[PDB]
Design a protein around this ligand. Structure first.
Ligand SMILES: [Cl-]
Length: 279
């Protein structure tokens, strides 16, 4: 399948070169997979989600996304125009308030929720969790992410936006989950992207067009935007039968575009998420 005039990050994920604008993918499009977006919520009514999004949990007075961040991330995973896996099922878990903040205890509860809740859902091709969130190092937050991964969920987490070593942030620093840095449309490390040995992969994160609340769209930047490219890619590859939840981060690194990014510090992987889709 070909999507013309695609956001640059979707074209980049299906390309061996920067500078193209068509996204190419197998028409299976993550059907039969599930992605949990653990964030500020998802505006499930947005036409871009086509009824494939729903809120399953909130820790606040509403399940609605009063911020936009979670809607944007969910759009990069699985919206019809802005998404990597255009037929996945999206489940929203609101651990972040409408100011985009959340207590670590709530984030942990939301991870343990997804590990159980997947057993209430139909995801024959597998389960992914996308965590465009984090804060300072916490062994308890890393452990929660490790449990979720162990339970059979492909966990993708943002490296963080401090232009620093991600070893000092959680859940970025958890070794067993997929930690995602951000790049720009010229294959440079995004200026804000964390780096370090705990990164597994880079995905598009500068100037990413996706869904927003009020049935709208906008372009924003962050390792928050790179993470759902990888979460969507995992869901797509799991539907194709190419990998499993336990091995998808490894598989994505194995099949990445290698050595194409600039301003990658010595000792950080130079790997850019790639779907290796051949028509
Ligand atoms: Cl809910």
């Amino acid at each position: 399948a070909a999507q013309t005039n695609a956001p640059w990050g979707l074209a980049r994920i299906s390309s061996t070169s920067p500078g193209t604008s068509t996204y190419y993918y197998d028409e299976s499009a993550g059907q039969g997979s599930c992605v949990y977006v653990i964030d500020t919520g998802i505006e499930a009514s947005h036409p871009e989600f086509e009824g494939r999004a729903q809120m399953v949990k909130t820790y606040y007075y509403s399940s609605r996304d009063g911020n936009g961040h979670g809607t944007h991330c969910a759009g990069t995973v699985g919206s019809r125009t802005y998404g990597v896996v255009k037929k996945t099922q999206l489940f929203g878990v609101k651990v972040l308030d409408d100011n985009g903040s959340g207590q670590y205890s709530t984030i942990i509860a939301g991870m343990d929720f997804v590990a159980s809740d997947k057993n209430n859902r139909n995801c024959p091709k597998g389960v992914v969790a996308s965590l465009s969130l984090g804060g300072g190092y916490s062994s308890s937050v890393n452990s929660a992410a490790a449990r979720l991964q162990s339970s059979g969920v492909m966990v993708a987490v943002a490296a963080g936006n401090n232009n620093a070593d991600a070893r000092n942030y959680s859940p970025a620093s958890e070794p067993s989950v997929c930690t995602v840095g951000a790049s720009d449309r010229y294959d440079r490390r995004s200026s804000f992207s964390n780096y370090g040995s705990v990164l597994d992969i880079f995905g598009p994160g500068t100037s990413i067009l996706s869904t927003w609340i009020g049935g709208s769209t906008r372009s924003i930047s962050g390792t928050s935007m790179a993470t759902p490219h990888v979460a969507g890619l995992a869901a797509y590859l799991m539907t194709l039968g190419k990998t499993t939840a336990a091995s998808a981060c490894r598989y994505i690194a194995d099949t990445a575009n290698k050595g194409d990014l600039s301003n990658i510090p010595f000792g950080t992987v130079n790997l850019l998420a790639y779907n290796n889709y051949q028509a």
